[PDB]
Scaffold this motif. Sequence first.
Motif, PDB file in Angstrom:
ATOM      1  N   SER A  19      13.261  -7.022  -3.192  1.00 10.90           N
ATOM      2  CA  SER A  19      12.411  -7.881  -4.070  1.00 10.90           C
ATOM      3  C   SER A  19      11.046  -7.238  -4.292  1.00 10.90           C
ATOM      4  N   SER A  20      10.362  -7.629  -5.364  1.00 12.63           N
ATOM      5  CA  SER A  20       9.078  -7.015  -5.697  1.00 12.63           C
ATOM      6  C   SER A  20       8.148  -7.920  -6.505  1.00 12.63           C
ATOM      7  N   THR A  21       6.850  -7.649  -6.390  1.00 10.80           N
ATOM      8  CA  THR A  21       5.821  -8.275  -7.217  1.00 10.80           C
ATOM      9  C   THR A  21       4.896  -7.161  -7.705  1.00 10.80           C
ATOM     10  N   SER A  22       4.674  -7.069  -9.017  1.00  5.52           N
ATOM     11  CA  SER A  22       3.920  -5.939  -9.575  1.00  5.52           C
ATOM     12  C   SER A  22       3.115  -6.267 -10.832  1.00  5.52           C
ATOM     13  N   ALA A  23       2.007  -5.548 -11.010  1.00  4.14           N
ATOM     14  CA  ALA A  23       1.139  -5.700 -12.177  1.00  4.14           C
ATOM     15  C   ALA A  23       0.605  -4.335 -12.611  1.00  4.14           C
ATOM     16  N   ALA A  24       0.651  -4.048 -13.911  1.00  6.18           N
ATOM     17  CA  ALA A  24       0.174  -2.763 -14.437  1.00  6.18           C
ATOM     18  C   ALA A  24      -0.656  -2.940 -15.702  1.00  6.18           C
TER      19      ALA A  24
END
Lengths: 6, 6, 6, 6
Positions: free
Chosen positions: A1-6
């Motif tokens: 699982s992952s949480t990301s912002a770019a």
Amino acid sequence: SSTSAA
Amino acid sequence: SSTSAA
Amino acid sequence: SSTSAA
Amino acid sequence: SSTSAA
């Protein structure tokens, strides 16, 4: 699982 | 599962 | 301005 | 301005 912002 | 914003 | 996910 | 994920 992952949480990301770019 | 994932949560993401770009 | 903003872009977001929760 | 902002980009965010939680």
